[PDB]
Design a binder for this molecule. Structure first.
Ligand SMILES: CCCCn1c(Cc2cc(OC)c(OC)c(OC)c2Cl)nc2c(N)ncnc21
Length: 209
């Protein structure tokens, strides 16, 4: 069964703001996702010091950027800690609620959208460039799941019967028609070099085709 949930009002409201505000500097969505991945890889690495069995789902700690012009997707892959079902449905949105208030407050005071990351809600910057985001994730303690939202105030969760991923997270950005620049190799390299040059894991930019 695919299950459908309502975002908290405040989260829905943030997402509409990100979709609706005029803001040209959309490229910062990629460092927000990569930094989420880097945080997630730090977590698993730390947890495995006191529990080496946590890496039985895979030792390699890395980030892949995968463009696909044919599906119009950019996918951000990591082998970090992953998320559980309770993360996806409840936990993450509960934390996200206060970062959302603070972010929204700071924007009136003239902070700008590029600062979303300081408020723990940088994931939603994905909606600057994506018409739909699909999140595939596998935590050690749990099953593999697919979360997916086109905003509009709802999200879905189902158990994923697709490829098994070992441990980690794929964020599949289904790009808006006029955002296909983020599928171009030189563009991605440029942004990674500009905003994400000091990440402590290998980041592989896959090329087509
Ligand atoms: C915000 C901290 C943790 C959530 N998280 C995120 C960011 C994130 C945050 C969310 O809430 C604020 C969120 O809920 C809609 C989310 O969706 C599945 C993701 Cl994807 N990315 C990763 C990742 N690559 N690996 C592990 N955990 C992640």
């Amino acid at each position: 069964e695919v299950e459908t949930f309502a975002f908290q009002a405040e989260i829905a409201q943030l997402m509409s703001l990100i979709i609706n505000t005029f803001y040209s500097n959309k490229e910062i969505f990629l460092r927000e996702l990569i930094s989420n991945s880097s945080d997630a890889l730090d977590k698993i690495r730390y947890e495995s010091l006191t529990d080496p069995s946590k890496l039985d789902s895979g030792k390699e700690l890395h980030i892949n950027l995968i463009p696909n012009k044919q599906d119009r997707t950019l996918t951000i892959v990591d082998t970090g800690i992953g998320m559980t079902k309770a993360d996806l449905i409840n936990n993450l949105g509960t934390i996200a609620k206060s970062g959302t208030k603070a972010f929204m407050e700071a924007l009136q005071a003239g902070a700008d959208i590029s600062m979303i990351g300081q408020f723990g809600v940088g994931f939603y910057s994905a909606y600057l460039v994506a018409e739909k985001v699909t999140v595939i994730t596998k935590h050690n303690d749990d099953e593999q799941y697919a979360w997916e939202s086109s905003a509009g105030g709802s999200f879905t969760v189902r158990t994923d019967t697709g490829e098994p991923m070992g441990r980690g997270t794929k964020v599949i950005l289904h790009l808006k028609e006029d955002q296909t620049e983020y599928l171009e190799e030189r563009r991605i390299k440029e942004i990674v070099k500009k905003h994400s040059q000091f990440i402590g894991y290998p980041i592989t930019l896959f090329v087509e085709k």
